[PDB]
Every structure is written in structure tokens, then in C-alpha cells.
């Protein structure tokens with residue numbers, strides 16, 4: 074079935090610039106059939122950049138999961154032909170390190186707090202920091218330092234972050250750690266993440282704690 078806008082970022086291979094035919098249009102929407110521009114959802118913001126040197130402001134998906142690229146100059150595009158794609162690599166790559174960071178934080182937390190003794194409740198990330206909302210009885214702070222040293226240690230050692238599909242479902246995994254059902258864009262190796270720049274703990278309420286992490 075090709076009625077689904079083929080995606081390239083899932084195959085990323087870190088490809089920065091892309092080129093693919095063009096499909097229908099809306100007010101600002103620009104349905105396509107090729108793209109390196111990651112839509113949204115899963116806590117990983119829509120990376121950005123330029124499509125034909127044009128300004129991309131929003132990038133999401135439709136019910137059938139069709140990537141629409143909300144641009145600034147919609148009055149410079151037809152309705153069928155072909156175009157070039159350019160994405161803010163850095164803003165992208167610095168998101169992968171972050172997103173891949175969170176998965177590692179998941180394992181690390183398992184090791185330190187004990188797999189089972191805590192519950193992930195919320196997630197998501199900004200362009201600079203990442204957030205992991207959790208539900209754990211003890212005031213996390215008493216683990217700040219043990220967590221960071223462990224996060225980093227794994228980093229240095231590095232490890233392959235393999236990814237795959239099992240039909241219409243995509244799974245990911247770091248080394249021999251947790252196998253996660255995430256749907257974002259990850260680095261190929263965690264050594265490509267970097268040590269923690271800062272790990273702030275805060276109480277979000279209802280007894281839920283929030284780990285915000287920053288990378289060097």
C-alpha cells in the first residue's frame with residue numbers, strides 16, 4: 074500500500090537533504106510522498122528547516138499518518154512535480170541524542186531504582202532538555218548522582234542502538250537493555266549522546282516526580 078506517504082527519517086541513515094514528488098495541498102498543508110522532515114508525536118517535536126529554501130513552521134501527520142509540511146510560502150508551490158528538502162540537522166541531531174538519552178535513562182533507572190519499582194508516567198522533550206515524568210516513592214534526589222555517573226558510564230562504553238519493525242509496529246533497543254516501542258529518531262550509537270549536563274528533579278504533583286535532563 075503506497076497511499077501512505079513514504080517516510081525517510083525512519084530510515085534516516087542521518088540523511089539531511091531529501092527530494093521527493095509533491096501531492097495535494099490545503100491552506101498551508103503540503104501532502105507529499107517523500108520526506109526527511111520528522112512529523113511529530115511521541116514527545117519528539119517536529120524537526121524543522123527549509124523546503125526549497127522556504128520556511129517550514131509546523132510538521133504533523135493525518136489520520137492515515139500522512140506528513141503535511143506547514144510552510145511560510147505556500148504561494149510558491151504547485152500541486153505536482155518534485156521538490157528539494159533541507160532540515161536543520163543540528164536541531165535534528167541534537168534531538169536524537171536527547172531522545173536516545175531518555176531511553177537510556179529508562180534502563181539506568183531500572184538498574185538504580187530497580188525494574189518494577191517505578192512507573193514511567195509521562196515523557197516528551199524540548200530542543201535543549203528532556204523530561205521523564207515518573208512515579209517513585211522516594212524523593213529521587215537521593216539518586217541524582219548515582220544515576221548520572223551510571224548514565225555517563227554507559228555513554229563512554231557506547232553501544233549499538235538497533236531498530237526494527239514487526240509488521241505495522243516499530244521497536245527499538247540499546248545493546249541488550251530494554252526493548253522499547255518508541256516512534257522517534259535515534260542516534261546509531263549512544264556514545265553519540267554525551268554525558269549529562271544537568272539532571273534536575275522536581276515534584277509535579279499527585280506524588281509524581283519529574284526528571285529533567287540536559288546534555289553537555
Ligand SMILES: [Zn+2]
Nearest residue numbers: 115175196255
Ligand atoms: Zn520515547
